[PDB]
Ligand SMILES: O=c1[nH]c(N2CCC3(CC2)CN(CCO)c2cc(F)cc(F)c23)nc2c1CCCC2
């Protein structure tokens with residue numbers, strides 16, 4: 106797809122869950138660089 | 152092309168990135184269905200991704216965007232989870248493979264919440280979970296996220312009902 110006219114990205118901002126942070130969309134692969142690769146496990150709540 | 156440099160846990164850069172991972176975990180309205188049930192991660196490794204051609208492609212576009220947005224690249228650091236993280240670190244992001252079913256159009260998606268990107272490491276909605284145990288909440292199998300430099304430029308603000 107293409108970004109909205111005159112824009113380079115979309116900010117998707119949750120307006121109901123006040124603790125949910127934003128999500129972002131770009132439409133050109135050249136607008137992101139994969140800088141860190143993080144290897145992890147999720148931890149079982151104790 | 153791509154080289155991966157291991158960061159020492161005693162390095163402030165490692166600790167800084169772990170802090171961004173840990174502090175952006177949130178509860179998800181699916182009760183953990185997609186990404187599993189957890190409040191924190193066990194970080195096993197953090198590697199710097201180095202690729203001169205991909206970095207040059209990125210900074211060239213960043214300069215273009217900057218000049219089109221009152222000299223402001225609007226560059227963020229954001230998370231990306233994907234089953235194809237290995238392809239991404241070697242080939243770069245590719246808009247030919249946008250997320251078609253995203254709420255904000257067919258594009259490349261990133262999150263401020265690490266735990267939102269964690270919902271995509273094993274596939275859309277967690278897929279069928281880890282390949283070994285078929286468990287979206289597996290505590291044993293290793294997961295991988297990318298922490299990415301993202302140029303937003305002039306960003307269209309779309310409020311969502313989430
Ligand atoms: O970190 C995020 N990653 C994503 N992905 C990444 C992976 C992707 C789905 C979208 C992409 N895709 C197309 C070519 O790979 C594909 C194909 C598949 F078979 C499985 C699959 F999981 C995907 N979406 C989001 C966030 C955080 C913000 C919210 C949305």
Ligand SMILES: [Zn+2]
Pocket residue numbers: 281282283284285286289290291292
């Ligand atoms: Zn597993």
